DNA sequence: AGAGGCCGAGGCGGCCTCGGCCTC
DNA sequence: AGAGGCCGAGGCGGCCTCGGCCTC
């Protein structure tokens, strides 16, 4: 199981671990099964402005924007409760557009997203 | 099983909404978990006395602690060493009366911390 | 300068130092000068339901109830900013009635309070 | 005084709203504070070079740091070692030009980290 | 150059439950 | 006895600024 996001996405993500800064864009790397579940659970839990689910090297990535700010640790705590026994990596996203755009182009692809035609 | 053997129930605290702490407890669980918990409870709660008993193809642990505890705390500890197996944890109001009953049929002593 | 409240009041006070519990009753031990100032500043800052100022062995004690809960550390942080260079001890009060009543009887006395006739 | 000597002002950054960092600074303060800060700044910021100068009955410190800093950070450090005395901290845009001017009259070198 | 968007470390100040204490 | 008020430790999850980074 992956220990981090794909190398090609790392420059868009926050790697902060000692910060209480809150933000409004997040990504989760997990199994197809757990990402499908979390897609709807995260959408509802955080009233997301946008969420998309993507293929990533036989796993899935969720990408989402929230209407209010959250600590990465909070999003992680939520997601980890619903993913006992499967891998899950949750990070804040700094370069939001670059991350989403990377996620729509090979080797990744969109599985589903909450707004028709995605973001621009 | 969803409760203790029906003939032990009057020895036990039947509290639901109490924050009362006590220093005698009983656990009803599987043979595997009772063997494991006998040792774990002894160390965790520095028990003054612990006994393990046979009870209708399951086991009962009976124990006295040197300090008082909530039933819910003992249960919280025991339950996270039992995430799959069955387990009922109850406080014991009638202490000697519970141990004595657990020493006579249908119950039998498997082991005790004091001979 | 005192290092704690008078011994006779200690059983009414919280001595917690490792807790983030919030409460709604506090006391401050400080100089006459700083207690007079804080009486009005605390009243306003926290919208107190009640505040009283008391003589205590040639210093003053402030006693107050707040309409919302606060960490002792928060009340302390506020009070300490306005008492650079003079002693100030700030504690939560557990036994609110017993504390206030003790504070109205010798060797303590009321200097001023925010409601006529005090509390009962 | 409320600013640097009026003839040094074109050597200095005149930023107010910038988060730009730099690696040359100047401090205008009292003789007592300049003697103290010369040593404190040297150690705190591991300065590559620091000079202390006379300026109209006060002193100027001039320093280069190995890493970049906000003027406000340098000021925050210097100000809390000066809670009573006057102190103006500014970044220096024209580095050699500032040091050279501070070596010629009306200014005089009291001391430099390099001869 | 100066204005200013960004972001990791980390202080601050609420919320909450656990697991004891107590009295009625 | 059981119900339940109380309270210290301490996890949680926002807010904020400092003091760097960057580009326009």
XYZ file of C-alpha atoms (C1' of nucleotides) in Angstrom:
518
model
C 0.000 0.000 0.000
C 1.115 3.543 -0.838
C 2.811 5.490 1.969
C 2.109 8.910 0.414
C 0.395 10.433 -2.658
C 1.895 9.802 -6.126
C 5.228 11.622 -6.513
C 3.856 13.746 -9.316
C 1.248 15.333 -6.993
C 3.422 15.984 -3.948
C 4.455 19.510 -4.948
C 0.760 20.614 -4.765
C 0.143 19.257 -1.319
C 0.917 20.555 2.113
C 3.440 18.458 3.975
C 2.993 20.478 7.234
C 2.785 18.311 10.320
C 3.397 20.830 13.125
C 0.850 23.443 12.006
C -2.636 24.264 13.284
C -3.345 26.305 10.145
C -6.767 25.494 8.779
C -7.598 25.279 5.096
C -10.340 24.584 2.669
C -9.008 22.096 0.171
C -8.050 18.483 0.866
C -7.218 15.219 -0.824
C -7.520 11.634 0.364
C -5.655 8.606 -1.120
C -7.383 5.362 -0.359
C -8.966 2.205 -1.810
C -11.715 2.268 -4.479
C -14.148 0.895 -1.893
C -13.378 3.479 0.802
C -13.214 6.410 -1.639
C -16.636 5.522 -3.010
C -18.056 5.522 0.492
C -16.187 8.667 1.576
C -17.257 10.551 -1.546
C -20.816 10.719 -0.218
C -19.910 10.829 3.519
C -17.445 13.735 3.090
C -19.853 15.552 0.771
C -22.494 15.548 3.481
C -20.277 15.892 6.580
C -18.512 19.031 5.356
C -21.113 20.479 2.981
C -18.458 20.537 0.290
C -18.527 23.183 -2.388
C -17.004 20.561 -4.721
C -15.810 16.950 -4.498
C -14.348 14.672 -7.139
C -13.156 11.051 -7.098
C -10.257 9.946 -9.321
C -8.436 6.798 -10.409
C -4.849 6.670 -9.128
C -2.662 3.623 -9.904
C -5.432 1.152 -8.940
C -6.515 3.086 -5.834
C -8.606 6.238 -5.696
C -8.015 9.902 -4.812
C -10.743 12.213 -3.450
C -10.305 15.920 -3.995
C -12.588 18.412 -2.223
C -13.190 22.033 -1.382
C -15.015 22.973 1.843
C -17.142 26.122 2.527
C -15.450 26.605 5.911
C -11.878 25.933 7.036
C -10.630 22.796 8.752
C -7.408 21.403 10.188
C -6.003 18.550 8.099
C -5.956 16.552 11.356
C -9.739 16.988 11.669
C -10.440 15.735 8.152
C -8.015 12.891 8.760
C -9.666 11.965 12.103
C -13.035 11.769 10.371
C -11.828 9.762 7.383
C -9.727 7.341 9.521
C -12.778 6.366 11.621
C -14.490 5.140 8.434
C -11.377 3.342 7.121
C -10.306 0.944 9.786
C -8.253 -1.867 8.116
C -7.597 -0.119 4.701
C -4.873 2.463 3.886
C -5.771 6.126 3.929
C -3.593 9.181 3.445
C -5.182 12.612 3.973
C -3.363 15.857 3.102
C -4.182 19.518 2.706
C -3.904 20.878 -0.775
C -1.953 24.129 -1.262
C -1.977 24.400 -5.122
C -5.650 23.686 -5.577
C -6.011 24.249 -9.329
C -2.772 22.452 -10.158
C -3.836 19.478 -8.051
C -7.313 19.207 -9.555
C -5.995 19.667 -13.111
C -3.285 17.054 -12.607
C -6.020 14.750 -11.302
C -8.060 15.041 -14.504
C -5.171 14.159 -16.850
C -3.255 10.890 -17.298
C -2.208 8.861 -15.437
C -5.262 9.919 -13.405
C -8.846 10.267 -14.409
C -12.199 11.364 -13.074
C -14.576 8.699 -11.777
C -17.323 11.077 -10.557
C -17.592 14.689 -9.511
C -20.229 16.797 -7.773
C -20.624 19.486 -10.505
C -21.092 18.772 -14.165
C -18.000 19.631 -16.199
C -15.831 19.975 -13.061
C -13.897 23.160 -12.233
C -11.921 25.684 -14.329
C -25.051 -14.671 26.009
C -26.408 -11.210 26.860
C -26.248 -11.335 30.676
C -24.615 -13.222 33.532
C -25.958 -16.666 34.576
C -29.416 -15.902 35.922
C -28.516 -17.146 39.422
C -25.601 -14.724 39.906
C -27.627 -11.612 39.110
C -28.492 -10.721 42.734
C -24.816 -10.584 43.661
C -24.208 -7.924 41.001
C -24.729 -4.202 40.834
C -27.696 -3.430 38.598
C -26.756 0.233 38.089
C -27.245 1.990 34.715
C -27.095 5.724 35.452
C -24.677 5.751 38.402
C -21.205 7.252 38.546
C -20.570 5.142 41.692
C -17.203 3.438 41.776
C -16.411 0.041 43.361
C -13.623 -2.449 43.975
C -15.107 -5.795 42.996
C -15.977 -6.821 39.461
C -16.992 -9.756 37.316
C -16.472 -10.494 33.640
C -18.404 -13.057 31.592
C -16.559 -13.927 28.434
C -15.129 -16.714 26.220
C -12.479 -19.167 27.526
C -9.797 -17.567 25.311
C -10.593 -14.032 26.488
C -10.884 -15.088 30.154
C -7.439 -16.677 30.090
C -6.051 -13.512 28.446
C -7.944 -11.061 30.654
C -7.146 -12.906 33.884
C -3.487 -11.874 33.402
C -4.175 -8.440 31.757
C -6.654 -7.346 34.454
C -4.252 -8.514 37.151
C -1.494 -6.238 35.857
C -3.643 -3.301 34.735
C -5.563 -2.975 37.984
C -2.872 -4.366 40.308
C -5.601 -6.667 41.615
C -5.458 -7.861 45.210
C -7.255 -11.057 44.136
C -8.458 -12.554 40.848
C -10.213 -15.897 40.240
C -11.204 -17.584 36.948
C -14.229 -19.917 36.878
C -16.137 -22.255 34.589
C -19.686 -21.222 33.789
C -21.887 -23.010 31.212
C -19.140 -23.489 28.595
C -17.868 -19.937 29.132
C -15.693 -18.429 31.873
C -16.156 -15.886 34.667
C -13.398 -13.692 36.050
C -13.944 -12.386 39.600
C -11.610 -9.710 40.934
C -10.902 -7.267 43.760
C -8.928 -4.085 43.100
C -6.857 -2.035 45.633
C -8.552 1.206 44.385
C -12.195 1.894 43.297
C -13.223 1.976 39.594
C -16.279 2.708 37.479
C -17.793 -0.407 35.959
C -17.663 1.494 32.641
C -13.879 1.997 32.954
C -13.265 -1.704 33.582
C -15.586 -2.469 30.648
C -13.805 0.033 28.375
C -10.461 -1.590 29.138
C -11.761 -5.198 28.725
C -13.711 -4.395 25.539
C -10.732 -3.088 23.597
C -8.883 -6.381 24.225
C -12.066 -8.136 22.918
C -13.079 -6.340 19.715
C -14.587 -9.571 18.243
C -15.543 -11.848 21.174
C -18.501 -11.529 23.602
C -18.035 -9.815 26.957
C -20.202 -8.651 29.816
C -18.615 -6.635 32.599
C -20.551 -5.946 35.860
C -19.744 -4.597 39.309
C -20.229 -6.981 42.214
C -22.279 -5.856 45.221
C -22.259 -9.149 47.139
C -18.558 -9.999 47.094
C -17.941 -13.092 49.276
C -21.436 -14.340 48.232
C -20.413 -14.122 44.554
C -17.021 -15.803 44.975
C -18.540 -18.584 47.137
C -21.308 -19.269 44.567
C -18.652 -19.331 41.796
C -16.775 -22.008 43.833
C -19.846 -24.313 44.030
C -21.713 -26.101 41.215
C -22.538 -25.317 38.370
C -19.378 -23.215 38.708
C -15.824 -24.375 39.165
C -12.531 -22.690 39.944
C -10.010 -22.874 37.102
C -7.472 -20.687 38.932
C -7.022 -18.145 41.744
C -4.291 -15.638 42.570
C -4.334 -16.962 46.148
C -4.533 -20.821 46.671
C 3.836 39.329 47.845
C 1.396 36.436 48.257
C 2.152 33.287 46.239
C -1.430 31.966 46.413
C -4.852 32.958 47.829
C -5.324 33.085 51.629
C -5.208 29.577 53.128
C -8.772 29.870 54.340
C -10.087 30.205 50.751
C -8.039 27.486 49.068
C -10.585 24.701 49.580
C -13.106 26.641 47.393
C -10.764 27.154 44.503
C -9.686 24.948 41.669
C -6.032 24.020 41.797
C -6.158 22.280 38.354
C -3.200 23.100 36.154
C -3.391 20.376 33.486
C -7.076 20.814 32.595
C -8.763 22.528 29.649
C -12.104 22.470 31.482
C -13.838 25.807 31.185
C -15.855 27.417 33.950
C -17.852 30.432 34.849
C -16.586 31.649 38.185
C -13.152 33.111 38.906
C -11.177 34.999 41.500
C -8.141 37.245 41.194
C -5.736 38.181 44.056
C -3.849 41.348 43.346
C -3.017 44.872 44.555
C -5.686 47.464 45.477
C -4.632 49.512 42.446
C -4.846 46.656 39.930
C -8.074 45.226 41.383
C -9.755 48.613 41.108
C -8.769 48.825 37.467
C -9.628 45.186 36.708
C -13.022 45.488 38.391
C -14.245 47.662 35.521
C -12.089 46.052 32.771
C -13.210 42.488 33.634
C -16.823 43.621 34.011
C -16.809 44.912 30.454
C -14.490 42.346 28.818
C -16.504 39.329 29.962
C -19.969 40.851 30.380
C -20.007 39.512 33.915
C -23.254 38.489 35.524
C -21.719 39.614 38.843
C -18.397 41.013 40.076
C -17.290 42.033 43.546
C -14.048 43.482 44.934
C -12.895 42.602 48.464
C -10.233 43.554 50.998
C -7.774 40.721 51.666
C -4.857 41.268 54.088
C -3.946 44.649 52.525
C -4.394 43.466 48.925
C -7.646 42.931 47.064
C -9.604 39.936 45.739
C -11.967 40.119 42.736
C -14.717 37.544 42.535
C -16.797 37.189 39.357
C -19.327 35.102 37.505
C -19.356 35.070 33.682
C -22.361 34.436 31.343
C -20.263 32.096 29.181
C -17.490 29.660 30.103
C -13.771 30.364 29.989
C -10.493 28.573 30.648
C -8.730 29.874 33.759
C -5.688 30.360 31.498
C -7.702 32.763 29.316
C -8.818 34.906 32.247
C -5.270 34.825 33.564
C -3.797 35.837 30.164
C -6.130 38.826 30.058
C -5.512 39.939 33.635
C -1.695 39.462 33.404
C -1.466 41.820 30.394
C -2.938 44.604 32.555
C -0.737 43.800 35.582
C 2.812 43.934 34.406
C 5.062 44.638 37.464
C 2.469 43.839 40.254
C 1.527 40.384 41.643
C -1.562 38.674 40.315
C -2.957 35.236 41.052
C -5.981 34.064 39.036
C -7.876 30.857 39.883
C -11.135 29.193 38.964
C -13.661 28.934 41.719
C -15.312 25.535 42.303
C -17.373 26.286 45.491
C -18.864 29.530 44.281
C -21.252 30.313 47.146
C -18.758 29.302 49.824
C -16.098 31.494 48.231
C -18.320 34.556 47.898
C -19.718 34.137 51.428
C -16.249 33.722 52.917
C -15.278 36.891 51.043
C -18.023 38.943 52.702
C -17.095 37.956 56.279
C -13.992 38.766 58.345
C -11.109 38.870 57.752
C -12.396 39.938 54.320
C -14.881 42.563 53.367
C -16.677 43.988 50.371
C -15.273 47.130 48.761
C -17.762 47.317 45.852
C -20.024 44.944 43.990
C -22.014 45.102 40.760
C -25.478 44.303 42.248
C -26.942 45.965 45.285
C -27.036 43.636 48.286
C -24.722 41.096 46.594
C -25.701 37.444 46.073
C -27.582 34.873 48.200
C 14.781 60.909 17.288
C 12.005 59.473 15.104
C 14.004 58.540 11.985
C 17.548 57.891 10.798
C 19.903 60.839 10.081
C 18.304 62.552 7.104
C 21.330 61.874 4.869
C 21.220 58.078 5.290
C 17.580 57.741 4.259
C 18.247 56.947 0.571
C 20.388 53.961 1.519
C 17.469 52.433 3.434
C 14.421 50.459 2.451
C 11.337 52.651 2.735
C 8.882 49.730 2.756
C 5.742 49.750 4.960
C 3.448 47.067 3.532
C 6.024 44.593 2.192
C 6.695 41.063 3.383
C 10.052 41.218 1.525
C 12.978 39.839 3.471
C 16.602 41.074 3.309
C 20.073 40.498 4.713
C 21.317 43.961 5.615
C 19.944 46.086 8.427
C 20.559 49.217 10.442
C 19.587 50.176 13.973
C 19.528 53.714 15.379
C 19.548 53.671 19.139
C 21.216 54.941 22.351
C 24.924 54.279 23.095
C 24.005 51.816 25.879
C 21.604 49.847 23.671
C 23.990 49.876 20.680
C 26.800 48.401 22.761
C 24.382 45.742 24.073
C 22.730 45.026 20.722
C 26.015 44.872 18.808
C 26.818 41.655 20.729
C 23.190 40.335 20.983
C 22.476 40.805 17.256
C 25.794 39.171 16.404
C 24.861 36.001 18.287
C 21.132 35.943 17.513
C 21.517 36.369 13.769
C 24.960 34.756 13.423
C 25.932 37.917 11.549
C 28.597 37.736 8.860
C 29.534 41.353 9.656
C 28.460 43.965 12.210
C 29.747 47.537 12.667
C 28.914 50.118 15.372
C 29.104 53.839 14.527
C 28.779 57.271 16.096
C 25.910 59.382 14.826
C 24.902 62.742 16.368
C 25.336 61.662 20.011
C 23.626 58.325 19.333
C 24.903 55.126 17.705
C 24.164 53.172 14.523
C 24.575 49.426 14.162
C 25.061 48.150 10.593
C 24.890 44.414 9.956
C 24.810 41.663 7.333
C 23.138 38.333 8.091
C 23.870 34.910 6.461
C 20.081 34.355 5.941
C 17.279 36.824 4.951
C 14.940 38.391 7.568
C 11.899 40.645 7.717
C 12.702 44.109 9.008
C 9.787 43.572 11.428
C 11.418 40.417 12.861
C 14.717 42.201 13.494
C 12.734 45.075 15.041
C 10.689 42.702 17.229
C 13.871 41.128 18.570
C 15.667 44.492 19.144
C 12.601 46.147 20.712
C 12.172 43.591 23.475
C 15.776 44.213 24.606
C 14.874 47.969 24.596
C 11.533 48.306 26.395
C 12.445 51.828 27.674
C 15.045 53.300 25.274
C 14.534 54.680 21.727
C 15.122 52.450 18.712
C 14.587 52.609 14.982
C 15.228 49.502 12.917
C 15.345 49.704 9.070
C 16.411 47.438 6.224
C 19.307 48.641 4.097
C 18.928 48.706 0.307
C 22.258 50.357 -0.531
C 24.663 48.217 1.483
C 28.267 49.243 0.662
C 26.969 52.839 0.161
C 25.545 52.816 3.709
C 28.628 51.326 5.376
C 30.951 53.713 3.474
C 28.866 56.775 4.478
C 28.878 55.530 8.110
C 32.724 55.404 7.918
C 32.999 59.079 6.819
C 32.040 62.251 8.723
C 29.700 63.017 10.548
C 29.873 59.283 11.285
C 32.673 57.330 12.877
C 33.426 53.664 13.402
C 33.428 52.612 17.057
C 33.950 48.926 16.214
C 33.666 46.303 13.456
C 33.569 42.505 13.479
C 36.230 42.548 10.745
C 39.196 45.051 11.114
C 11.292 48.441 -4.390
C 7.398 47.912 -2.312
C 2.889 45.638 -2.136
C 1.081 41.720 -1.104
C -0.452 36.425 -1.684
C 1.029 32.355 0.550
C 2.168 28.890 4.254
C 4.430 26.097 8.343
C 5.215 26.606 13.319
C 2.948 27.245 16.975
C 0.235 30.206 20.810
C -4.554 30.675 22.198
C -9.080 29.461 24.022
C -13.344 27.208 23.404
C -15.730 22.360 23.007
C -16.012 17.512 24.563
C -15.529 12.758 27.337
C -13.243 9.537 30.830
C -12.957 8.123 35.001
C -12.528 9.263 39.331
C -14.603 12.054 43.617
C -18.824 13.228 46.318
C -23.937 13.388 48.426
C -28.969 12.288 48.263
C -28.069 0.984 45.589
C -28.587 3.674 42.088
C -29.046 8.382 40.310
C -26.577 11.977 39.491
C -23.745 16.635 40.490
C -18.982 17.647 40.270
C -14.123 18.173 38.500
C -9.020 17.360 36.785
C -6.620 15.291 32.836
C -6.439 15.673 28.508
C -8.081 14.845 23.269
C -10.095 17.709 19.686
C -10.545 21.360 16.259
C -11.281 26.062 15.265
C -9.102 31.011 15.595
C -4.959 33.968 15.284
C 0.073 36.021 14.288
C 5.213 35.604 13.190
C 8.385 35.325 10.133
C 9.841 33.261 6.411
C 8.851 31.972 1.136
C 7.230 33.659 -3.448
C 5.629 36.788 -7.721
C 3.896 41.202 -9.740
